[PDB]
Each structure stands twice: as C-alpha cells, then as structure tokens.
C-alpha cells in the first residue's frame, strides 16, 4: 500500500575544506555522473527522491563552498537542517585535522543536536603511486581508516564513510545512512 504514501521532506548539507569532492560527490548522487570537466563551485537547488526502509523521502542537497560570498553566506545554509555531511580528502591529512579544528565547532554552533556523518573521500588515491610520492614528500601518507573512524568517534559523529566520488563507490550508501540520520 506504498503508492499515495506522503513524502518526507529532509534537508542536508554538506561542508568541508575546499576542493575535497562536495560538489563531486552530491553530483555523483544526484546525476550518476562524476563530473570530469566543468564542475561549479556548488551544486545547488536539487531535491533527490530516496527510498529507505519503505519510507519514501525528499531530500534537498545544500552544497557550500568557503571563498568571498560564499564564505561569508554558508552560515545561512544551516536553518532547518536535518543531517551533516562533514567531509574531508583521504589523499590531504591537513583536510582531516581542519575537521576538529573547524568544521566540527561551526556546525555544532549552528546546528547542535544534527547528525553528522564523517566521510572520507578520494579513497581511490589511497594507492596511487602520484599521491603517495607527493605526500611522502611532506612525511605523511593518505588517510588510513582507522584513522577516520578516530577522528568520528572523537566529534561524536553518527558515522563514518568512506567514498570515491571518482569511481563512485559508497556514494549511494553515504546519502542513505545520511537520510535514515534524517529520519530519527
Ligand atoms: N581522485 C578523485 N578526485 C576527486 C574525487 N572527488 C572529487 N575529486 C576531484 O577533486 C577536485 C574537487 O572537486 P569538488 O567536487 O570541486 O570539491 P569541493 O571543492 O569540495 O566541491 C576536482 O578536481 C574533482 O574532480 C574523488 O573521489 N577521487
Ligand atoms: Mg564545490
């Protein structure tokens, strides 16, 4: 008896340092494609339909982004939001320690009892041979798993993911876990 079944309106947003696959991975979701040439600083207006555990669900994606307008605007991003993405680079430690030191205390001053899902993108570059030459350079590696679920359990994150926007592997998965958080 699902057909006629009102929808369940949730809203997302997703943040984290510059460059580590947001607007990627919220394409990759949306589109099914991994946008290999001409993607915008954020993808905004999208309204996803999702299905979990028979309760069929609206979920509005807000992408961010941190220069100029942006920047100064992302707080208003905030209101009314349901579930966090907080989202760093496998292949950049430095994204990882901004996840304590900033993202963490931003979105629990705005949204404070919001689900954060923790995701590690880029996990493709974990064994490329040009990634790990370059952060070997600064006597670092790419980010371990452990390492991940480390730094989610510290932030009392709901969960934490790991994804390839590039291959898109985990990609559906993070947005369903993200829509049951929604849900509680
Ligand atoms: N190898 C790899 N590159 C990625 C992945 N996700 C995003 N990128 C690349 O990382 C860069 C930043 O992507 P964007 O989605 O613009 O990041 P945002 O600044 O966080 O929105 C672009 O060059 C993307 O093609 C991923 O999972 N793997
Ligand atoms: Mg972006």
Known sequence: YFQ???????????????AVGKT????????????????????????????????????A??????????????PLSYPDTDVILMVFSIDSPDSLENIPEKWTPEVKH??????????????????????????????????????GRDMANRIGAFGYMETSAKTKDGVREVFEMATRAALQ
């Not at 079944?5 to 809203?11: F, N, S």
């Not at 990627?24 to 993607?39: A, G, M, N, R, T």
């Open 24 to 59: 990627s991975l919220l394409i990759v979701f949306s589109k099914d494609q991994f946008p290999e040439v001409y993607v915008p600083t954020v993808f905004e207006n999208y309204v996803a339909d999702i299905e979990v555990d028979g309760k069929q669900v609206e979920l």
């Open 61 to 74: 994606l807000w992408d961010t982004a941190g220069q100029e307008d942006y920047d100064r605007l992302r």
């Open 110 to 147: 705005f949204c404070p009892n919001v689900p954060i899902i923790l995701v590690g993108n880029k996990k493709d570059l974990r064994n490329d041979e040009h990634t790990r030459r370059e952060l070997a350079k600064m006597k670092q590696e790419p980010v371990k798993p452990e390492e």
């Open 4 to 18: 006629g079944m009102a929808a369940i309106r949730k809203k997302l947003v997703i943040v984290g340092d510059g």
